[PDB]
Write a protein that binds this ligand. Sequence first.
Ligand code: B12
Ligand SMILES: C=CC1=C(C)/C(=C/c2[nH]c(/C=C3N=C(/C=C4\NC(=O)C(C)=C4C=C)C(C)=C\3CCC(=O)O)c(CCC(=O)O)c2C)NC1=O
Length: 337
Amino acid sequence: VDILAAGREELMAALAEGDEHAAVDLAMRLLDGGVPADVVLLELVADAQVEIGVLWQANRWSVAQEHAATAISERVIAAVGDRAAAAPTRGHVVVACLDGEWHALPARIVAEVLRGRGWRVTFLGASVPAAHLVPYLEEHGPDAVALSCTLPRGLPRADQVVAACRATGTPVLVGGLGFGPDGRWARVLGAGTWAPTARAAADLLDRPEWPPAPPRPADPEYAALRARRAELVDAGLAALHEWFPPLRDYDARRLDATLDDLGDIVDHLAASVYVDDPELFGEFVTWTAEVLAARGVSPASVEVALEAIARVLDDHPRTRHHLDHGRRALAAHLEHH
Ligand code: B12
Ligand SMILES: C=CC1=C(C)/C(=C/c2[nH]c(/C=C3N=C(/C=C4\NC(=O)C(C)=C4C=C)C(C)=C\3CCC(=O)O)c(CCC(=O)O)c2C)NC1=O
């Protein structure tokens, strides 16, 4: 009687169909049967969300489905979290998404698991500016701040926000997909203490030791990518005009989508360079190829843009390595698909 495997399928069906009654009731029945709340949130809800991500990437997930499924998940997490909340005896943890980060569900799961272990949690929500977060810490003096980052493109900003929080004397936890496999990009930056899940985060806070770091060498190549972003986007676009025939026939909507995506390409290259890990840019490029291909856009367009960006930045040595690796990963992806 693998109740978890059965539950996983039932929840996914409810989310995909927008059935809020079935989803919330399933969560309540699991708790009725003594299934731990952190199991419901991590092995069921989080897992269903991963699969939704896969459907979305493959262009099999509508706007209407996003709203319905996210709203239901908010309700599930709220009901489970409140039900399993323990007496707030241990202290106070502030939880926040980075500025420009709208993936609040992972952070809310962290918040609820912590409540379930006796922490008072203030959840400051999605996209919290440091200008708001830092004063909050200085006057409330929580035992810890937990910063969530899901998008690797947010890593440079993460590094800044972490440092600003540390300057308050507040111990910093970090997590989310944005810090990469095994938190490798958290470790590169020496950013707070990373943990893979809410359960692991709570376990960290049970350690008796309870887990101003100078090393931050100037990165001029990173700064050049920020400063020259529009130039690089334009070079991308010009190369696509020349060498990517379908672009000539694009309406305004499609030119705008192209410009947005070119901007993201530059931003992910910047993040890659910032943490000195071309694998960031590599995995981003091959992911982009799948995203575009599933929407009828030839991923050969990406090679045209990357090659053009590479010409402009050919005298930027680290950056041209990142670009080489991206284009190489793309080529291998397109041969091997
Ligand atoms: C739902 C969703 C959205 C929702 C989020 C709504 C909300 N309230 O959260 C909305 C619709 C807003 C959205 C928008 C976008 N998203 Co989205 N989406 C997702 C999705 C499907 C699930 C998110 C989720 O619930 N995760 C919950 C579970 C799965 O997360 P988890 O990692 O197990 O959580 C644990 C750890 O992260 C850890 N943790 C997290 N934070 C912290 C903090 C601390 C301190 C600690 C210790 C631990 C910790 O603990 C958690 C709990 O155990 C994911 C797919 C995915 N794989 O995550 C994408 C995904 C993250 N989204 C993606 C994208 C691209 C987007 C958009 C850019 C798309 C667009 N619109 O152009 C935007 C960007 C918004 C932004 N600026 O942030 C991509 C990103 C890939 C990339 N980096 O390039 C993903 C991976 C989907 C995909 N397969 O392509 N998204
Ligand atoms: C280099 C050449 C290049 C071209 C020519 C390009 C074109 C391009 N991308 C599109 C959509 C898209 N492109 C993306 C890609 C992303 N969304 C994200 O959040 C992130 C980070 C990415 C990846 C970079 C998505 C998600 C869509 C569909 C979503 C939408 O715009 O509604 C579309 C519209 C598809 C359609 O509806 O007809 C076009 C024409 N993108 C390129 O990168």
